[PDB]
Amino acid sequence: FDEKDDKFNSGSEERIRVTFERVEQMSIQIKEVGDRVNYIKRSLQSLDS
Amino acid sequence: FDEKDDKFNSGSEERIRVTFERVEQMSIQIKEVGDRVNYIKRSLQSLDS
């Protein structure tokens, strides 16, 4: 059962699948941070005086 | 027609394709945020006094 994860993990089709699920969630997080960077640049950096 | 998206989605060639389109627009967003982080570090953090 340990060696059974030579196929189900560490295959081409699973590593493509997990990065597809990692990048999909990841792009959402950058879009949130990229809107949060634009929020900090708008609110805080204009109000530095 | 639901099971028809076992092939067109969830194939190796489509999951590679979408991450290719996700990472391409993703790197643009990091380049924008990475220039926006350098902009906040330049303008705001030097003007903290």
Swiss-Prot record, chains A, B:
Coiled coil: 17-49
Residues bearing PTM Phosphoserine: S10, S12, S43
Traits of the deletion mutant: Inactivation of Trpm7 in mice results in early embryonic death (6.5-7.5 days). Mice die as a result of trophoblast defects and consequent failure of implantation. Tissue-specific null mutants shown defects in cardiac and renal morphogenesis, organismal Zn(2+), Mg(2+), and Ca(2+) homeostasis and thrombopoiesis.
Tissue: Found to be expressed in brain and skeletal muscle, with stronger signals in kidney, heart, liver and spleen.
Compartment(s) where it occurs, according to its Swiss-Prot or TrEMBL record: Cell membrane; Cytoplasmic vesicle membrane
Entry comment on modification after translation: Autophosphorylated; autophosphorylation regulates TRPM7 kinase activity towards its substrates. The C-terminal kinase domain can be cleaved from the channel segment in a cell-type-specific fashion. TRPM7 is cleaved by caspase-8, dissociating the kinase from the ion-conducting pore. The cleaved kinase fragments (M7CKs) can translocate to the cell nucleus and binds chromatin-remodeling complex proteins in a Zn(2+)-dependent manner to ultimately phosphorylate specific Ser/Thr residues of histones.
Similarity annotation: In the C-terminal section; belongs to the protein kinase superfamily. Alpha-type protein kinase family. ALPK subfamily.
Assembly behavior: Homodimer. Homotetramer. Forms heteromers with TRPM6; heteromeric channels are functionally different from the homomeric channels. Interacts with PLCB1.
Protein role: Bifunctional protein that combines an ion channel with an intrinsic kinase domain, enabling it to modulate cellular functions either by conducting ions through the pore or by phosphorylating downstream proteins via its kinase domain. The channel is highly permeable to divalent cations, specifically calcium (Ca2+), magnesium (Mg2+) and zinc (Zn2+) and mediates their influx.
Protein name, UniProt field: Transient receptor potential cation channel subfamily M member 7
Organism, scientific name: Mus musculus
Origin organism lineage: Eukaryota, Metazoa, Chordata, Craniata, Vertebrata
